[model samples]
Target: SERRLGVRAWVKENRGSFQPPVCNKLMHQEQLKVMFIGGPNTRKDYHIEEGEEVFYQLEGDMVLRVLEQGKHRDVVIRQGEIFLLPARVPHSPQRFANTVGLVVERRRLETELDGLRYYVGDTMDVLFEKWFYCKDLGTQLAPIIQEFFSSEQYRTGKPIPDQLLKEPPFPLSTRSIMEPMSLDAWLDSHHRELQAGTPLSLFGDTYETQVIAYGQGSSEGLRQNVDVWLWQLEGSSVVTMGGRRLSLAPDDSLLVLAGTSYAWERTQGSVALSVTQDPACKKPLG
Candidate 1:
């Protein structure tokens, strides 16, 4: 079977109004697991997983509680808000009825175990934990992808950090709990000039996230060293990749493979959200 080139999901259109809570899988790549979680009272135990996870609120609000630095804290994620939960962080989400959100996570390897940990009395001591030992998430060539990112022989393209190799229970990096930001407000405040993209560095060198805008007849070339995901926020555009053109409208998402060349041409004005691995963090191989 031919692998899917990319995926397009309309967050608002596919949301469950009367349906039960559903988790719609968008894409599960070598280093990414994208999904849309929609519908009712979705409460779960803290997810102490292996890689980074990002939660983006689409419809309604949510209270995301986390255990950080030995203290219990939480953040209210309203529509348009984003919370970047770092790797190994424990988070218990309380999602209201009719809430819709997007979750993006880095898939774990065979050697790595994803844990759903439960503690007793605000402590790190695990009372009960459900471990996910299966590395393959039912995707074709999943093991090969996992080996490319996990094995030392293939991972030599870039050096894995010492902190990431230690397998610590807690996150080495800080979490990003971003308040709801309006594109109109951001454009009004910063788009005095004709800037094509406004980059946001909320997550430091861990990832690259930005808001990109295109004017009428404007085109932008794209080349990514790491995997990239694009979410259309407003308006529409035609994305050309490998001689194929994909029309993207509001709420549509496309995952571009690493090292692929792409271009975005806008017939009308458009705005998009782009997330990718940080190129600055990559070190040259000997």
Candidate 2:
């Protein structure tokens, strides 16, 4: 497997062969899993990830059908764009043909619920729902054999009849439909805060997204209690993890494991994103 543990290569190099709804996992670590997911899937069922899912559109475009209050809405993710979907949000990703995306998600705990919800056709009301635990499925799964979505069925890798597919119950529009926060547009507005020595928080929930701009070296040697995925958007930055030096360029990603001693040494006019899991999450019966 060309998949290494740390220092991931460019996103273009990580894509594997795929079809609609098919995915190629690039990083399958204990705490995190990153994959390249393809599109053209006209799926109507909404996926409720108990954990936050990061959507980075690499090729083409897609719409995320999400439930905000009781009403359904759409969040468009265009090419060269990114969005962080909060946990417990029911999202039906409407991927178009030839569209490809990078999805980053944390491993669900054995207790967290993985749900697939089907809506009523006309009113788009919740008609039915299926929930299951994804982790420890090899052993920690249910006692009944056929009561749940079988693990084997997930590997079928086939498709249903196209005529049987349900068209989205909602109409498509770019007007009142909510939009994802673009990283480039964010940087354009928040450039001043970074120069004043601050890590501009983009968003946070299960995982926090911060846009950090470094004016120079030695920014207190920031460290965290959980594992982190670091990626540079522009300029560039350096890390002195203990005694070793690692420089991060644009489009490449680096992983820093939990509780590791690390500090930053970034030059002026540079910014990067720091992503890690939420801390309030409970520890096991440990």
Candidate 3:
């Protein structure tokens, strides 16, 4: 990790890597962009950032290593998976592909909203300070799981729905899918909000698709909930739990609790998907 330069400032000036013509039209903010990771010969130099980032592996297999000033800190990767990456760490990647992936970045938001409250709290501009702090913390602690996303210990027993309400907030939820298929086509929705095929729910469960959002918050923070099988859909966001920070892309899935505090930083937009337990663990996360 060469702690000499800040990545955001450097990336802002180095438009070639950070910005592209296509990205401008897809997303209006300077906070997010998408790009390709190509192959073995291609490697991004070590850089630091004020905010964080998330990556979704759309294709291929690769090894991503994080170093701290020439000292090894972590080594994890995704071969056909999606995962998140934290900010300000000196790191680089080595890919073996037909390498294809998505990157999501966090932006410093002028206004912030409370996810729990579903709106900006307080009635004054002074309240904006909390949003700013949230934005700063979103970027600063992006490497670690956020409070809401912190992975909790969940029980499984077939992807069944636990109905609480019959409406928008999902009165009841489960992590099951309609069918088994390669999620490549739908996994690329990390950039903007897009809708797709709904998953079939078990008897008494709500009929809906598990919704996963990438590049969450004004800053880049990967957000996952029981509503979707995000671990299976994939990204550049690294998931850490059980004493490991797994770097995932497309094709990789995680078995986690809905209460888990998972965070993501999208350097670009990313792919989100639905997932659930394997046949053996076909139980709900109670």
Best by TM-score: 2
Best by lDDT: 2
RMSD of each: 9.9, 8.3, 21.1
Better of 1 and 2 by TM-score: 2
Q: What clash count does candidate 2 reach?
A: 0
> Stretches of candidate 3 above 4 Å error?
1-29, 42-44, 68-70, 107-286
TM-score of the candidate numbered 2?
0.72
- What tens digits encode model 2's per-residue C-alpha lDDT throughout 13-61? 5444435324434454646556666656666667765566778787888
The TM-scores of all predictions, comma-separated, are 0.67, 0.72, 0.30
Q: lDDT for model 2, on a 0 to 1 scale? A: 0.58
Sort the predicted structures by TM-score, highest score first: 2, 1, 3
Tell me the spans in candidate 1 whose CA falls farther than 4 Å from its real position: 1-13, 16-24, 27-31, 42-44, 109-111, 121-125, 133-188, 193-203, 206-226, 266-268, 277-286
lDDT of 3 by residue, 61-103 (tens): 5555444343444344454454444333334555553454444
* Model 3 local distance difference test score: 0.33
